[model samples]
Target: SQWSLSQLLSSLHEDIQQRLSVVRKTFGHPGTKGDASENVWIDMLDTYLPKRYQAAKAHVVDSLGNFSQQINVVVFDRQYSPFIFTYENETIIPAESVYAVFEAKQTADAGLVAYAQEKVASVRRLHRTSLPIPHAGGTYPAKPLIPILGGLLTFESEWSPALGPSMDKALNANLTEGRLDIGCVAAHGHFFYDQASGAYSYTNENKPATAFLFKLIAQLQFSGTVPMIDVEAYGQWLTK
Candidate 1:
């Protein structure tokens, strides 16, 4: 009981940093480094995120058979929504089941940030159907959709000051659907664009990984849960 909670927390964050470093050296095909980096982020999410949340590399699909570009990391609901189609290698997730989406890369540049924004827009643009919840007491009306969180993850930033004005500009370039909510650069800093506060903030403090993880958890808490998906909508595809 004498252990320092803060110190141990920092140590745990350091463990994540160490793991991230290994993938930087992991080489194979041209995109293998990127593949490894994406896998590592998913691994971290699986280890720390709530049990109800599942993380993976997947393509977001709507009930109408429209598909989003392959997303690097997806934090989705697993308990209420468990019908993800994993066909051999590729995984396609229902748009309604998704909570957050991220693009994992080795560096955060203007182009990369823009790329991430478009990727985010791809998913947000897809249609999601919400249905009333049938509970023990009564039937709840269809819940309004929550804004799906989006962001860019990287090992470092291209700017001199990692989370500076240029970064802010890029983050703000896409206003609505392409808006980024939260992100982390393991070796640099963690950043967030507060929609409510109408501001952006970042910290390059020690144990950034730890900070990023806790911030993500807090934001996820604020996001609550995904809406009850309309299963019959997707069922229509097989009928015809």
Candidate 2:
């Protein structure tokens, strides 16, 4: 039987509060409005989204009108920044029921990868659920995650340069470790570096490399056909 949404929220809020205290201490935050807002938002999301997900699970059960079926669900929060993009969560469903693994995120990138390193480890300590990647759901599971880099690249110029080194650090931290399957660079422009590779491309359009990465992730998570491209190739890949 599923815990009532209200009850679950009440229980999770307490846990979130306690854990948030640790985050505050670790970050050396002073509990200002931003801090408070962040904490509240975290708790609220932790309380609500999962509850809705639970509701979805319940609806599936009610639709079938039986508890004999066992259904398991895993929801990994992929969103980071301006919100609590911390770690992942796994919710086990009932038998013979529909199993779901939902990943939610606003923008996915190196930031998400770094956050995953910290939070996934913590979540593993608290819960005994399966990892997100290498087990997306079925037998022929695709790679674990999809990168959602925004339309704007904060640094790095056009006509040459590639993804910054920090990007590689995050990729290596997660991809090399095998915690994630793939990532989607959700940007607006293609790669177009000059012959000297002085900077990245300035042209703004959906380049083939953009979709190429997405397809590459699918291949890896499902079949493992291609070699892992250098993070530097990202800028080139997208622009190419």
Candidate 3:
């Protein structure tokens, strides 16, 4: 039988909650570490994001060969981005092709938020060059590039406010040039920054994981594909 839109949405939400339960329960072990936990979440992201986009832990590089700080979760365009360096399990993605980056942590706290901010900054600060789009008629002028989204994912929260005032204050305090755009504490709630208001808003009163995933996917859909990367611009660094 064909279900109503509301029914389908409700079912989807439940499934997301169930999937997140696995991460919450299994991520508590000490051995999970940052790497293992990151691996798990990236797997989840890979399953949900559009097929054209890929999610992984990687270092983002500019045409100049300068690389961003190690990123825990990178959502990039698979169709346009090149995997320049793949050694062992590590890969490097060009900054121009990145759509988002996230820091995956077992716990959430003010200190971790600060750390995530720095990691996100590393990618945002890197230079990305976009070229004009060519068509049968003529080349269209390049539009302003959208800023890459950044986020944090955690299993639990350790703040007194737990997605309330204290946590919001800390997040805002650390919101610098490139800071968290969205985040979720599996045991608490998810929050996102509003570029228009310069404030954070919380959602999913009891389903942080679902809210985080849904919002991130919605944002990605709205952002569309990344701008065309000027590969030759990066090649300029190769000859130097």
TM-score for each predicted model, relative to the true structure? 0.94, 0.26, 0.86
Worst 10 residues of 3 by lDDT: 9-18
Deviation (Å) of 54 in candidate 3? 0.9
Point to the candidate with the largest lDDT: 1
All candidates in order of lDDT, best leading: 1, 3, 2
Cand. 2 TM to true fold? 0.26
- In terms of TM-score, which candidate is stronger, 1 or 2? 1
Model 3: per-residue Cα lDDT over 1-240, one tens digit each? 975976655554555445555655766666655556676578778877679889988899898778899888889997866777789877888888899989888788888888888888999888888788777999977746888898998876787457877677678877776578998876677899987997888874555666788889988887777888888887787767
* Candidate 1: clashing pairs of residues: none
Q: Which candidate is the best by TM-score?
A: 1
- Tens digit of lDDT per residue, candidate 1, span 14-121? 876777788776675648888877877888899988887999889999998999999989999978885659888778889999989999998889999999999999
Candidate ranking (TM-score, best to worst): 1, 3, 2
- Residue-wise C-alpha lDDT for candidate 2, range 1-240, written one tens digit per residue: 875966653454344434444544465544452344344333433444423222211111111222212111132222210111113442322211221221223233566445544433322222111222332564433323232111211111221223445444444554222233323222332232232544333333334223323333333243222111122322243454
Q: Cα deviation of 6 in candidate 1 (Å)? A: 1.4
Candidate 3 residue-pair clash tally: 1
The local distance difference test score of each candidate is 0.86, 0.30, 0.79
lDDT preference between candidates 1 and 2, better one: 1
